């Protein structure tokens, strides 16, 4: 299964110029485009190698759409001020995420469109792609306007059509990276904390996609509740990192095993500290 997701952020900044509009696009865990209204010459720009082959009609077209969206979102920030009776002096944020999920055969699984105003749910397109769930009185005003203007049908047309079509195209063009899991490189480090205790840290580096499981066992007993597990983090080269650590009594180190589960690994992986 695969996904395409776009994330738009619009942020007002009174006495600091017009609102900033930033948009990013992902296929699965890979960012492929960006637009930033604060760039020197604002344009949709490539962020993955497999999108670079797109020609001028693509980039000019996306740039045109981004500029128009920035203007619309700037107006939407103004409308929100009215709905919520807010002052022109405060900074506010609209966030929108939308896109489509497809199955292994390329058929649409689900469409998405949901948003937040100042970090709180605002309005979301329901799974039926025909109705809206509105979080508050303001979003209810929007819901009615959108029912009147047949917005759901237009969005449905995108999600079922163009969204799926281009996702399939991106998946084929970037198949060597997007459809080839990168297994983690793994190792265990050992760090004495005192003469009586030591940290064992199990590393997973350079993996893709981001989903992974990293656990410690003592004598084959799971130690999840005594494990420090850091949030999965970007390496900076389109792959990910994670580690899991336990503090163990000195002398118990060889009883501890680290277990790694990842799509890029054929079978569950088990490691120990090798002195």
């Amino acid at each position: 299964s695969h996904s395409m997701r776009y994330f738009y952020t619009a942020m007002s900044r009174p006495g600091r110029g017009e609102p900033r509009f930033i948009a990013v696009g992902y296929v699965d865990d890979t960012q492929f485009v960006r637009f930033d209204s604060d760039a020197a010459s604002p344009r949709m720009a490539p962020r993955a190698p497999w999108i670079e082959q797109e020609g001028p009609e693509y980039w000019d077209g996306e740039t045109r759409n981004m500029k128009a969206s920035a203007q619309t979102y700037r107006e939407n920030l103004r409308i929100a001020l009215r709905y919520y009776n807010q002052s022109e002096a405060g900074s506010h944020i609209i966030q929108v995420m939308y896109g489509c999920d497809v199955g292994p055969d390329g058929r649409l699984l689900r469409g998405h469109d949901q948003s937040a105003y100042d970090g709180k749910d605002y309005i979301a397109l329901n799974e039926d792609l025909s109705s809206w769930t509105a979080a508050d009185t303001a979003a209810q005003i929007t819901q009615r306007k959108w029912e009147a203007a047949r917005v759901a049908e237009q969005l449905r047309a995108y999600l079922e059509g163009l969204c799926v079509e281009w996702l399939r195209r991106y998946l084929e063009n970037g198949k060597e990276t997007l459809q080839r899991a990168d297994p983690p490189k793994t190792h265990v480090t050992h760090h004495p904390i005192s003469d009586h205790e030591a940290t064992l840290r199990c590393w997973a580096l350079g993996f893709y996609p981001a989903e992974i499981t990293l656990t410690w066992q003592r004598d084959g007993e799971d130690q999840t509740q005594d494990t420090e597990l850091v949030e999965t983090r970007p390496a900076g080269d389109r792959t990910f990192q994670k580690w899991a650590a336990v503090v163990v009594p000195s002398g118990e180190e060889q009883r501890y095993t680290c277990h790694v589960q990842h799509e890029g690994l054929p079978k569950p992986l088990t490691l120990r500290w090798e002195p």
Binding site: T72, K145, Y158
Partner: peptide, 10 residues
């Protein structure tokens, strides 16, 4: 490619 909806005001 991004959605191409015309002037979607809230």
């Amino acid at each position: 490619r991004v959605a191409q909806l015309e002037q979607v005001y809230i």
